[model samples]
Target chain A: SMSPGKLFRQAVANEHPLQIVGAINAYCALLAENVGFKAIYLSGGGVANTLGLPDLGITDLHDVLEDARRITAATHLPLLVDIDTGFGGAFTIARAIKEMERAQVAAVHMEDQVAQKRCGHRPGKELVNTNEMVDRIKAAVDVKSNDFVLIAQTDAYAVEGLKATIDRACTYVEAGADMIFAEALENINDYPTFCKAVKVPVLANMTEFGKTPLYTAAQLADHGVKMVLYPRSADRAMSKAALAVYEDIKKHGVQTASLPFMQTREALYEVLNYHAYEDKLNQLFKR
Target chain B: SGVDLGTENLYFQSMSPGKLFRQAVANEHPLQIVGAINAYCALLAENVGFKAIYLSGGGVANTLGLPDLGITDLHDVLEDARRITAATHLPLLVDIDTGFGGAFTIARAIKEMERAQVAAVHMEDQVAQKRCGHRPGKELVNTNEMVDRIKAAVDVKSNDFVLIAQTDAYAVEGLKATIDRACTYVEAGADMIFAEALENINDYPTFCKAVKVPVLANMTEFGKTPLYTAAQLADHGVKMVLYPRSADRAMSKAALAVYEDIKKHGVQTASLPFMQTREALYEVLNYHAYEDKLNQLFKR
Candidate 1:
């Protein structure tokens, strides 16, 4: 079997921007690969909002880990996940690493958001101490059983400022983060500046209607960013399409007219590779 | 849903009262009630001498990382059912809460469950509701809507597939009313009738007498009903007894214990007692056997 590190190396060697689309579940990862994306991302808020729950840290290790397994099994694409504050404490962080490795998600990023316990006194959100987050980075780096990349994410830039966030990044690199995701780099000019200071490969989150401007892959690449994640783009499109299907079906009492906007049944079967499944039997029985 | 048959014991229970009565027809000895969590847990229960493994709605919700607030989707549960049924030779029973969605969604679930080769599934009389308060409020569709759901499911599921009708009317209505509701459900082509929330074990005979079908005994722990043994339930005209999530609850408590201790104590060494050790887990998982099979297949 091929290792995740080799997968990462291949992804890094790609000439175009490695667009990692979102897979809320494992099957979605397969869907992403079938749609011709090179890599997939597991969105934290996507899991929360889609599950009709909040991103207020109600999810745990087993939840994320199980989804990771399904996603990995459905596709060979290296999966990246949002590991908010490593799901609490050192051992929890360690477990997240091992489980992520086992699930074969190629990479994961841990943020400075305080885990659901202490900072949860407010019940919604808060950030962890910088030094404590550095310890988390150390814990994550020390515990991974495989060559799965650990991307350190800092929300400090949004909360504190860029210089402090840069200092935090420097500390995380020293503590051993393989890559850095400079989160919410609001000032478009700050992208090149942050990339230049980080030294390690960086990722830009081009999430729409968020803090960061939706910079094209070219603009991000020009700033020395290694990868760009259009996470939730497909999901958003799919959700809107599903809503349209619902509206049309409800209004007309049939899905006949709205079929154009939806993925055709035959096309879905094709993507699911129905014949490939049938061919498996032929290859064995006919021979 | 079908009863969780213990590997070494003979346990069979349907959620439907008529199905439970029919299961009673096979009773000469104690029926095995097996507990399960994931598909693998079902396998383990089967291997250990259980008849069938039951997947509870709560079990699915908990595994999917949500509270049992009914947030899980049919595709999610169907995916899980698919994995369990695909891997296990023994029968797999599923809880299809409100048929996962409306008429069409229910039809799709039945088709998908057939593809997964699940032996049985139960659709409840509860209104198809949701989690996260996105839509809001608790409500129920009329009997006709629920009947349409059962008809849709029955129309779609394979011939050998089981259709169990579960009604929460006992709490909503009186016992006689609930039994009447169950009988109507059976008349509408339900393979079995499940009288939900029968606080009394002797009530099984009443339900059995009312419906010309099998009746199931839910011997759940921590619920209002007593955890009646197989013999007692069998004596009360109960056919199959289900302990959905019994094994999962045990496992979750165990896993949670390990999680808490490891994080708090800064070491997993102390929590080793709560865990299936690495070797034991690997043995159960048969990680090495998988490698051996692959090696043999490739002639390596």
Candidate 2:
């Protein structure tokens, strides 16, 4: 079996600016596989919000790990999960890293955000000190097997500036960040410089309504971006569609109005490979 | 003090899950415990006036894209149960098929679910290995070991945490032997009886009368049991009515539609009519309360 990490590196080799589509659930991961995605993304916020919890850093490694293994079990695409600040300190990061590797993710992107530690509130994306961020990168990669891609994501672009973001990325690469992701960069011009300075496979987050512009895969590739992350792209649409069906069903006591929109039972069985299990069962039981 | 996200401390409610479950059963006439596939459905079931929800082993396996052949063990069911229990206030009843393993394994499953704030678990007496087919669904463990399994579950807890012992014996051994087994189970300290595969609604009363404990009637769709109304079950002395897989089946149907429509169309524009608006979703999510929590904590 090709290592999921090896598959990921191969994906990066095969496709420039590899589109990492977000899948919040297992079935969605199967759908992603059907549509020719080389890799899958699991957003921290998307998982939380789908469970009806706020994305404000409430989900833990356990929650994310629970969801990840399900998606991993459902599809072959190398999965890259959002490990928000490695859940806790260095020891915690090691545990999280080991657990995620065990969970079968090809890679994980850990961001440089202050741990939502206290019983207090964090207004938004606040960067840790540069040394603190570097230490996090060290801690995450310390348990690495080179078989896994440990991406160091910097929120420094927003809280500090472009100079600080590149400076952080430079040290991140130095501290064993297999890949660098500059979250929420404001300018397309910033990529050429960021990619030139960092010198690793840099990721450009094209998540909708974020600071980063929705540049096409070709455009980002031109600027030397190797991975284009669309975290929560499917989640955004999925929740919307789910809520619509839920509301209609709630109000009407029926779902006949949405039958045409739904994937027919036949199509669903095809996608899910429903008969494989049936064939196996009958064969095994002497039926 | 609420279901704190960062605190690592659960069991926020003063009442144990078992106590809450008992209360739920006592209060509602023939409690309508709807089944859920995930956390969101659990929340939805709670919001729609369901006092209790179920997480069936069949539901877990099928939803995870696998057959319900004991492939989904303790952790698979536990993870989903943890998610659902974390998301809602309703008491959760989980299906622990044959307790996954032997006595120690059953003890661990009970303790883990207790820690995760799960209210109750119903462990069946079917043979763990499904590959060997004798009587198909009727292949059950010996009545005495089944009693031992119930005792294993019973000795684990010192609290009101529920231990529901389910018997699939009727399909194999007939009503006389099944009733004998149910008596032994209750004697072994089972809080409730899950009478699986009793095709007749009238047989519910016969079992209920024979057993000392409260009886749960399975109302699963497309099964041997008819979809008896909760009121109908109440007439038959059924204390709990399990409607496992109704909501999950519907939820999957809706989700698949959206997935298909989105894949074929590229944009969810046509599917938008089927979706609830952002504002409506936020209302369901209580998104602003999280913001309020942030502000409240920050001011301190």
Candidate 3:
């Protein structure tokens, strides 16, 4: 019965840069946890892409909370969600954080980017003023009802370079960010420097096809990073896999040839713990 | 650049479900409705030219790893409903099983569903811990209690929110008795009637004849009723033909394949062809339009 926030804190303490994998839904959360991931992440891009949308900041708090509630409901793992610019301004972030806690999310990372945010790796990213971003952080911290970790992300590294990004990170720390996610850092050397300057847990985004190199947890830990996030990795992989299935079905007229490529009903039942539900039903309605 | 972007009042952001649903019901003959278990599925349904969307009780339970039994709460369905409504402004019809308990609970559920922008909700007359409509061994509340449930649901509402009453009594009490029940429910203020588990398509016309309100046909997959086309249902005077859980089943089949492929292949390279390409995905997500709006609204 450990709270997701406390569990997330414990995971960060136990592992250097806890290798957090991003899950797009509840079933994916179960998959990640069953595969031994200590923590899970829900990316904004993952949400948009999975919902057949792009990483544009078009979705609202209700959209993200739906996924958060589903993932947390299915698994006990601590979930860290990507709230794209807190879904709006100060009051919006405040409301978003409270709802996130109600949905039992362990943590959420709000960015300093403009409300109409692009994918972190995408170019032409726009950033809000440092003070405006600081106000967002303050609103999130003040509204949190539980031990929800508020990680402030700065896309300023790509827009304004490392110095401004670190300065923003320091300001976010002063504004009560539990961690700093330095988005799009060009050099591994910057990880240690940013961690030193911020004096808090630092997260390295290792998303594919992004500016950051796909660094290993070991490599990031060598630089004093506390978390290595593989955001959208699972999503990218799943999308590719799903496309292949659709093509094979279209070409083959039936999924018989693709049965070899399916998680059989048995495996799905096992991962979803179908038997446990039956047991609970019998226990609850024992008549 | 820092000016407030009042884009929240734009076309997609501001359509009320009640207004849209009334138009949908009036406009389409036997509205082609499909179920969506998540936001992506809802978007897929909307993009596919579906007139309205449905949130199935069984689909919600399955998504949450529970059975069609009443274990899933109001919050479980509401979360998904809210996501779908937020993602797509298409009128959404939700299934509220046995009103989730007595009159008070039903009233609260109606209020919340309306607040969540759900256009309509169909509450069945089966007892709590109810079986799926298509399943055998179903039971029903007495006519009086079911009418009370309908009255409770109708009592608390904004006028345009559609309230549908579904009766599983065709199996337990013959067609005539079921028709009597429907008339009573309509009298009790149900905006529509969903006659569940009808093995015969001909029965639709009868229900439509008896229940003056709109009649819905549950065209679920692998269920009791044969899949009837919209043309046929419209001819029969059915107002809504629901394919609840169809999209959910298709999505599940596709996702399972992807999960299994990745597990066995050690890579997703083989599964690439089956996916909607990144470009196609962006098109569906309207990536360029979003960028255009940001640029147009803010002079940054």
Candidate 4:
């Protein structure tokens, strides 16, 4: 009877630096859980990339919920999904929040990376510009959030400098951000400053080949980072692995080389727990 | 003009989904049908020279992290079905286990599938409580009951929509009863007969000879049926060969390998050999088309 949102908070409190690994689908989320990851992340970039989109507003909300349904169904680990931007305005954000809460995902983090041209039409008296992020944060935190963790992700450091990023981060906290993720942090040392500036727990991205140095969970904990995300790390590898297998099936027509790497049918059945379903059936049906 | 993503006019031609499925079945020697768990998989399977694709009931349930046990409803299945059909014009045959309910439900399902742009759906004769795959003790409705389900489907819509009547009676009631039921179903207006769980390859020709409609074979991996090639199935009179979980199963294995490696060794830098490069990913997704749209839509 543990609500995923509280479990996520408890996970943060329990683990020094939670390694919230990225999963491309439900199966991978289960894989992540079995590998000792207390929390998992469904990156918007990962979802878009997997679905073969250019990575933006084009990513469908329904598709992402399909993903959450898959993962949350497979594993008990509280999933944190990325709602890339507040699609159009607050109503869309509310719709996204309400639906995801219905999806039973542990947490969701929307960002201020709305660099496109749309948010201005005040047919809804919508807020845009610098005030937009706070408005988005309030809508995300306040709507349908007698439940779910709301992490306000800010990409302002990459755009408007560290001060702007921190300012927006604090404003979001005031608007009720359960956690803060300062995306695209170019300097590792800034983790110290960024972590203390926000009273709530902060998230650091240690994605490979990114601006942030590949820091271990322990290393990030040293800098007072409570949550370190390795988003799309697994997905990038999965994409490579699947494409290789796909290419092999094309080139050799028999996929012989990649055959050994397959984790086996029975192996996956164990992970997905195919038998438990039958057991449940017998338990429910048989006298 | 540049790939209207929202409109059905973007892909729906004069030939409807069921018509396209019929054409593919006859044109190809036992059409090689691949199962796609999602839209991307549909695209990938289409790219891999598959003539048709499918959405299995178990595939949807397993992928969604649930057991097949008649858990997923029309909404859950329809969402995935729409995405796959939207992704490609390939005739998508969906698995609507027991048509979800009685007469009225089957009637509604026909309308929904038509709207969703799906071609054919195999409504099994399994009792409302379904099993994951062909397992023992899987109950089946009597011939009269299943006949009514088919009657509801055929009665509601008589367009190009293909209603593949899948009878699970073979495993439970033996081949004689299965053929008898399939005949009754075909009489009830099933476009094709899905002879499920035929343990022998020879059983295919038996069903095909007995039933005048196109006999479809489920070559789903690790199941009652063996992995027969298109040619092997063609010789046996199986007009359609369905590899419902081959791609999905393989992808799950590969994805898990990546997850395990990343867990054991963080960064995943050394795992590049197995990973698909950015260039390849773009190539498969046809990323440049979206780029082209950007210019065509807004560029000066």
Candidate 5:
């Protein structure tokens, strides 16, 4: 009965704004929710990176929604999805909003970068100009049927420098962006500038092995960043877990064959909550 | 939501069930079932005149070269269901074996399927739902546990969705016990009862008498059930009969026969009867109609 927006607002109001992360699929999302993260995030880059592609915008709306459905299905937590760039032009953005609403995603963010194609594999990147990005922001805002939070990501810090990046963030906010993702910023010092300029909830991408340093959550909050997403953190852990499973399977000729390393079938079922189903059936069928 | 008459294209006459029963039912026609493993099959099924679509627990495992074990999760099933439902307004009937987990998982499955616009789902009371190495061996949850599953599922479902309770209990328990279990399931809010592995034809009347709700018959080939006609089933009070894999099996044989002949002759010119031409396939897919719609909407 609870709307996703109200839940999300509650999450943002909590002592520390929830630091959501990506779970590649439903099982991982359930794991994240059960383990006690207040909110969930679905990463476009995570989808591509896991699928052996790049963050270059080659994935379609349907591709992203597949993962979104999985994550939302497994957990009652509010979801923040990375939309990349509305997946296309104005009409496409219009179509996407309705689709995302149906997919039950809580919030979605669009980036200022031009959608890169051919697998985002090429090194150099190109971004849409500020005005175009603002128009995209307006288009995304105009079509949303629900109060799904819409955040704007700016790549201008690397492209047009600080002043322009701050200016674009301000414009996106003016264009109805609920939050600002000042993407690819150079340092922790740059955070305060954008935070002050944007005046909206700001998100810091604390991705490991990235251009920016891995600042702690405390440091980001002190710098005025309201939310931080370690999109690859859970995925990175899962990749390690899966590799271990694979290595052990190869070594022992069976998956998770080791008694200590593997979660038992019963243990796995507990996470899946098989007993809850039985209770429901009993209640429904009770004479 | 409409049906996807998948790999199995042949179906009993639409009016036959109504005629046989002397009462018309909405889905009385022998439901032309199709196995949809992905979004495209759903699309293909929708483009054709399918009234419903089927997602088999074993079909997915078979696609991955496993037996009818619960190796796949609710998310895996929801992916195909969501993809297909998004593309078309077909009523998807998914198989959520053992509700894919406990109460919360089953509840999640119902919510996800509703979100995905699925019309119905059948969750079986299979014991030991998991397959260790993706092999086939059917186990069932206890009767009370299965009843609880039905109850939880009923509690969580949206108004529009239908839940069918499946009893594999017939194999372990006698017919009377299975009938008793069916009564329990019906009380738990199962919209229908699927008496799985019903090998004897005479058992239909007895099972129907035991439960007040609609009963579905699984008329699958290579299984124990005799391939009785749909009219006979309707006469016996069977509301829905699913020929789950007939088309897949027939299509496989036909397609394979063509493939072998083409390999032998280096052409399909002589295997015309065995192979539906590319043009004919396009006709069924209605390629031109889509192009026409696009032209009308955009080019004009």
Candidate 6:
């Protein structure tokens, strides 16, 4: 059995631009893992939106860790979590790294944006000074206990342009980041450019309704990208689907009318391995 | 500058669930505490006007893909309880099956539950290798052993935190013996009594009148006891009616339907009818109010 961090590194090595799907909860993680995904993601925005809060810096470390624990516990897929601005300065970033490791998260991407960060796709992404950001990375790298991958994400592409963003990525790598996640890069050409500029593995944020176009895994790999993140696609679809179910039940007397739209009991049992549990009981208890 | 980050962080701190729970018990007779298996479901329960919520041991094991054979530990129940508390401010009552071990284990469970901001917990009187209350062949610890469990729990918890002792002796010992055990548990400093698997609704008043403390009626569906409504239980002097595992069962059914629908229909278009709307989700999340608070407190 591999540790989550080792498994994540192996998956990244195996897949060119590993397809990391986002999950809002444990059940969603199970759904993705059962679908043959090598890795899964937990987005900061996904956590906030699911909790009914917006994508401001309002969501805290505990909120993300709670979701991370549930997701990792339910599935074996290594999880890549988005810890926006590492929740605070040096001390807080260290604490976030320790807790995430305790929760068995495989990897995390800490942003260089200011503490009062906005969503990557949203406007008003203010950067912390380069030195301050380097200190944040150093803080996380210092306390990380295991092979958990430390990714330095910069929201500077849209604000400071490509040259500065690539320069920041290089500095972050020197500060001990294992990877780089460049947010809101408008053109695909810049990916290979950033990959060339930064010697470490590079990630592409392919979230929908954002400035970046949805690039296929093969295309991203061809352009020198190592990981492509679809952070909230599943959440957006699931939310829309769940809402339709609610509206139908509200207008209609019973939910039976919408039965065709739901995940079946048999399928759920298979995913959750209902029979495996029964077998464990029979084997262990012998009753 | 903007809002003091240190002060803003304090907003996430937990309020005293014990004090709020004491008030809830005083205000509502047969207070309806619905079960919530996760944080989202906890929000739904609060939206539906439930004064309090419950975290069931069975629900945790079943939902987490494990059986209810005492394989799950205190951390499993505590994690679920913490998530529910974080989602809603409603006082949550949790089930710690047989206190997970003896006196020391019971004390640790109480301390952890308090740390998680759990409002109350019910420690059963059954043997550690326990079965569900409604199930047959249920075993029990002797009166002295069960009293020790209660004493440890009562001594460790905060003053306002309610501790209910659940006794599964109704079938084996009969009503007279059950009442005798209940009196002993109350004397052991239990804040309330949960008379598990009482076959008769009429017997509820018997325990409530004699135990001299609040009584809890388990109104779980498909259980030994018939589903008694809130009004009937309140009339019978039952102070709390717990629908443990009800919401989980409903949510499971809904989730199963969605999975089956997608598998068959190849899309969620048909399942959309059964889910809550995006607008409703936002409303429950209090999106606008949170945004307003951010602006008022942090705006430059």
- Best candidate (score: DockQ): 4
B224-274 in candidate 2: lDDT tens per residue? 554555677788898987767555454455444544544454333454554
Retained native contacts per candidate, as fractions?
0.00, 0.19, 0.13, 0.33, 0.60, 0.04
Shift in Å, residue A83, candidate 3? 4.5
**Candidate 1 residue B77 C-alpha distance from true site, Å:** 3.1
lDDT assessment of candidate 4? 0.75
Q: How is the predicted docking of candidate 2 categorized under the CAPRI scheme? A: incorrect
What value does DockQ give for candidate 1? 0.02
Q: Of the pair 5 and 6, which is ahead by lDDT?
A: 6
lDDT of 4 by residue, B207-265 (tens): 89889999888765555554555676788898887766656666776666656665666
Q: Write the per-residue lDDT of candidate 2 for residues A96-140, one digit (tens) a residue.
A: 888888988999999888876567755467888878888888888
In terms of lDDT, the poorest run of 10 residues in model 6 chain A is A245-254
What is the DockQ score of candidate 2, to 2 decimals?
0.19
lDDT for each residue of candidate 5 in B16-129, tens digit (9 for 90 to 100): 211322222255464545667666666667677676677776676666666565667887777666666666555667888787777667788887777766778888877754
Task: Give the per-residue lDDT digits (tens) of candidate 6, residues B28-52.
Answer: 8657776666676666666656678
Q: Give Cα distance to truth, residue A44, candidate 2, Å.
A: 2.0
Give the best candidate by lDDT.
Answer: 2
Model 1, docking class: incorrect
TM-score of each: 0.54, 0.75, 0.69, 0.84, 0.61, 0.69
Judging by TM-score against the true structure, name the best candidate: 4
Error of 1 at B85 (Å): 21
Report candidate 3's interface RMSD in Å: 6.7
RMSD, every candidate, angstroms: 19.9, 6.2, 7.8, 5.3, 9.8, 7.8
Q: Judge the docking of candidate 6 as incorrect, acceptable, medium or high.
A: incorrect
